[PDB]
Design an enzyme around this catalytic site. Sequence first.
Site, PDB file in Angstrom:
ATOM      1  N   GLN A 168      32.976 -65.104 -42.181  1.00 38.42           N
ATOM      2  CA  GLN A 168      32.778 -66.514 -41.909  1.00 38.42           C
ATOM      3  C   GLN A 168      32.248 -66.779 -40.499  1.00 38.42           C
ATOM      4  OE1 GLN A 168      36.385 -68.808 -42.047  1.00 38.42           O
ATOM      5  NE2 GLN A 168      35.292 -70.703 -42.541  1.00 38.42           N
ATOM      6  N   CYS A 174      42.905 -63.820 -48.097  1.00 38.11           N
ATOM      7  CA  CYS A 174      43.522 -64.193 -46.835  1.00 38.11           C
ATOM      8  C   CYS A 174      44.021 -65.622 -47.001  1.00 38.11           C
ATOM      9  CB  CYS A 174      42.503 -64.095 -45.685  1.00 38.11           C
ATOM     10  SG  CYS A 174      40.837 -64.718 -46.071  1.00 38.11           S
ATOM     11  N   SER A 175      43.535 -66.532 -46.170  1.00 32.00           N
ATOM     12  CA  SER A 175      43.895 -67.926 -46.356  1.00 32.00           C
ATOM     13  C   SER A 175      42.888 -68.600 -47.281  1.00 32.00           C
ATOM     14  CB  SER A 175      43.937 -68.646 -45.006  1.00 32.00           C
ATOM     15  OG  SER A 175      44.496 -69.937 -45.168  1.00 32.00           O
ATOM     16  N   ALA A 176      41.655 -68.731 -46.805  1.00 33.83           N
ATOM     17  CA  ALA A 176      40.605 -69.392 -47.561  1.00 33.83           C
ATOM     18  C   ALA A 176      39.919 -68.408 -48.501  1.00 33.83           C
ATOM     19  CB  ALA A 176      39.592 -69.998 -46.609  1.00 33.83           C
ATOM     20  N   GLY A 177      40.101 -67.125 -48.231  1.00 36.72           N
ATOM     21  CA  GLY A 177      39.517 -66.110 -49.084  1.00 36.72           C
ATOM     22  C   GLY A 177      38.046 -65.908 -48.786  1.00 36.72           C
ATOM     23  N   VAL A 178      37.648 -66.142 -47.541  1.00 43.34           N
ATOM     24  CA  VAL A 178      36.252 -65.933 -47.172  1.00 43.34           C
ATOM     25  C   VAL A 178      36.082 -65.115 -45.898  1.00 43.34           C
ATOM     26  CG1 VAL A 178      35.536 -68.053 -48.341  1.00 43.34           C
ATOM     27  CG2 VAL A 178      36.117 -68.138 -45.921  1.00 43.34           C
ATOM     28  N   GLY A 179      36.898 -65.384 -44.883  1.00 47.87           N
ATOM     29  CA  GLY A 179      36.644 -64.784 -43.580  1.00 47.87           C
ATOM     30  C   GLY A 179      37.078 -63.334 -43.484  1.00 47.87           C
ATOM     31  N   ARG A 180      38.383 -63.136 -43.366  1.00 49.10           N
ATOM     32  CA  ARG A 180      38.940 -61.801 -43.255  1.00 49.10           C
ATOM     33  C   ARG A 180      38.661 -61.044 -44.553  1.00 49.10           C
ATOM     34  NH1 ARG A 180      44.928 -63.681 -40.966  1.00 49.10           N
ATOM     35  NH2 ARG A 180      44.208 -64.695 -39.033  1.00 49.10           N
ATOM     36  N   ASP A 199      46.322 -65.102 -34.176  1.00 51.69           N
ATOM     37  CA  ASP A 199      46.046 -66.439 -34.682  1.00 51.69           C
ATOM     38  C   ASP A 199      44.602 -66.807 -34.380  1.00 51.69           C
ATOM     39  OD1 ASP A 199      48.924 -66.251 -34.707  1.00 51.69           O
ATOM     40  OD2 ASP A 199      48.902 -67.079 -32.672  1.00 51.69           O
TER      41      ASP A 199
END
Length: 288
Positions: A265, A221-227, A189
């Site tokens: 990110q 991923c979630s926001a589509g930027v970090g992972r 997390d």
Amino acid sequence: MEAIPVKQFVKHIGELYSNNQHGFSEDFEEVQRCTADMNITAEHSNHPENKHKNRYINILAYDHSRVKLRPLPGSKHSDYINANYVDGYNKAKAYIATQGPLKSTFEDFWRMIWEQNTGIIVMITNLVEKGRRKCDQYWPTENSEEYGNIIVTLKSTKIHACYTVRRFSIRNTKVERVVIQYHYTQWPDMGVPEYALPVLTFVRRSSAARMPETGPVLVHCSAGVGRTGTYIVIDSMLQQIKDKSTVNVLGFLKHIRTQRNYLVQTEEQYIFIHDALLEAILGKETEV
């Protein structure tokens, strides 16, 4: 763009770590600033009719590289999805980077998959993490589900230690296709994975699944930027290493940052990329 031999890149990593990771910090700061004066716009993302289509109000899709849906009857903005084409190694638009789909965007999501001829989905998040909703389940738990004109059928599921693979077939009822989802499931997390090896195996296998010549690989991923950025960078650099035994993380990252906001990110993620590449270089494979 100025690439460096693997041997030099490995020594460069030692340097970025030194002096309390001082070099990593200046690198990422440079990354964080590199588009600030480019006035890259995202009017569509910000249009009030698309608002409920965005998972986070401050995570946008730049206009110049956004994926466009074919328009619908009825409808002006029915072309919008929070998603951007992103370059890969020696191949423009090798990926689509997108947010975790919302219930309200399930139809759009699958329509994009159809219209883009996408065969591989890479999912780098669980549906819920640390009690927080990160993504909605856009695929049938079993059997079939209809999402507008596209019917999705789950054909097989293979569960591995750190990831799961799901095989769907999808049918357009406006009038077939195999779509394979690689879902990394072992993710903390907070922060990045302690060990890079599991991630490397996931990247290697999901990347090899890409068959010629099909549409771009969808990565979310979630926001589509970090992972998502992290995956794109590792995948690309690995390909560059296999091809030329050279690497250029910073240059590549600055480039794709023009294509979607905040790709890779956090500085922690930027560091993980280098740790991952270092272990790939030490562990194999030829011409190091």
